[PDB]
Amino acid sequence: SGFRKMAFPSGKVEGCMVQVTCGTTTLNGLWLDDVVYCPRHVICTSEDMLNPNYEDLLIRKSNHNFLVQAGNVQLRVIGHSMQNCVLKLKVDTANPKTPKYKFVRIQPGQTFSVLACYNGSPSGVYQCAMRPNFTIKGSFLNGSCGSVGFNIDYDCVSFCYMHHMELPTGVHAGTDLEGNFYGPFVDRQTAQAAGTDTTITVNVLAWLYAAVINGDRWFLNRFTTTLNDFNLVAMKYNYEPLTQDHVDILGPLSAQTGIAVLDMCASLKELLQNGMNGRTILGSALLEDEFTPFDVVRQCSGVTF
Numbered sequence: 103s104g105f106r107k108m109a110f111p112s113g114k115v116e117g118c119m120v121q122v123t124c125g126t127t128t129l130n131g132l133w134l135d136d137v138v139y140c141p142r143h144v145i146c147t148s149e150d151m152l153n154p155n156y157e158d159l160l161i162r163k164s165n166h167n168f169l170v171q172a173g174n175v176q177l178r179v180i181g182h183s184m185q186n187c188v189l190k191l192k193v194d195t196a197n198p199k200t201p202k203y204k205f206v207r208i209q210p211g212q213t214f215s216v217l218a219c220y221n222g223s224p225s226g227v228y229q230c231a232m233r234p235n236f237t238i239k240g241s242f243l244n245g246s247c248g249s250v251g252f253n254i255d256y257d258c259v260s261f262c263y264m265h266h267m268e269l270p271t272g273v274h275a276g277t278d279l280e281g282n283f284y285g286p287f288v289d290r291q292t293a294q295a296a297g298t299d300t301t302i303t304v305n306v307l308a309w310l311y312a313a314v315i316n317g318d319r320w321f322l323n324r325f326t327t328t329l330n331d332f333n334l335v336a337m338k339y340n341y342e343p344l345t346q347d348h349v350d351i352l353g354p355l356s357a358q359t360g361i362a363v364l365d366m367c368a369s370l371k372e373l374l375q376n377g378m379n380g381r382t383i384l385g386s387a388l389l390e391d392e393f394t395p396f397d398v399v400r401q402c403s404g405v406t407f
């Protein structure tokens with residue numbers, strides 16, 4: 103038993119991180135087959151970041167302007183092109199360590215693991231949620247750019263995120279691996295507004311089910327509710343509203359614990375109205391929204407890769 107914020111094992115992704123250098127701007131790139139993907143802002147000088155014309159900047163550049171080191175190795179760039187906000191560098195060598203993988207664009211509330219990197223070397227791994235406002239609350243320094251987010255479904259690495267920027271607010275924005283931003287961010291150093299951030303209600307429900315599994319049962323109560331009365335209370339406290347799809351996703355945890363979804367919402371209701379009153383749930387004094395109902399099930403079933 104027990105309950106931790108687990109990341110996916112990182113091995114399969116470590117063998118794909120390379121160092122990309124253009125002029126004196128060095129950051130991380132992802133090497134799959136014979137292509138290196140990286141943030142297209144690698145071609146900017148710090149002066150260039152206030153108002154980049156990427157088409158104009160990329161034309162001054164040539165294959166041999168780009169240094170791709172894979173540890174002790176240099177790769178040879180023989181084609182270069184821009185897909186939206188990513189640079190695709192065709193290299194002379196397919197990565198022998200290219201796992202089974204796909205590119206996926208994820209939805210708000212989905213969780214993934216980040217391999218944080220500097221000069222193409224892995225630093226650490228953590229789990230996080232894509233916020234409803236399309237930002238992540240990550241841990242990135244300078245040179246972390248090109249660090250990626252990924253899920254593993256047995257043996258297949260799904261890549262969903264590439265790190266491009268910190269906002270003046272200290273939260274983190276980037277792209278899918280086709281180079282389209284999550285949210286309304288642009289890769290320009292200007293004041294940009296994240297939305298209002300909401301709580302991922304379906305994840306909090308998944309996590310109360312995880313508490314009940316692990317013996318922590320104090321918040322369960324006699325009461326109940328409907329979807330509508332629940333959703334009314336949720337909106338007041340900046341919680342995302344709950345649909346029928348969400349109830350369908352919770353059914354296995356409802357079957358495994360013998361607690362109706364609506365009964366769990368009734369318990370959640372009371373906590374938003376009355377709070378914890380000093381108590382904790384799975385050793386936390388706040389309501390946690392960074393576990394999906396899939397994460398909870400995976401961790402309480404012991405699903406491997």
Ligand SMILES: O=C(CC1CCCCC1)Nc1cccnc1
Pocket residue numbers: 143151152242243244245246247266267268269289290291
């Ligand atoms: O925010 C950036 C990149 C932006 C990209 C757009 C132009 C300005 C620089 N760097 C970074 C990321 C994470 C932690 N520290 C620094």
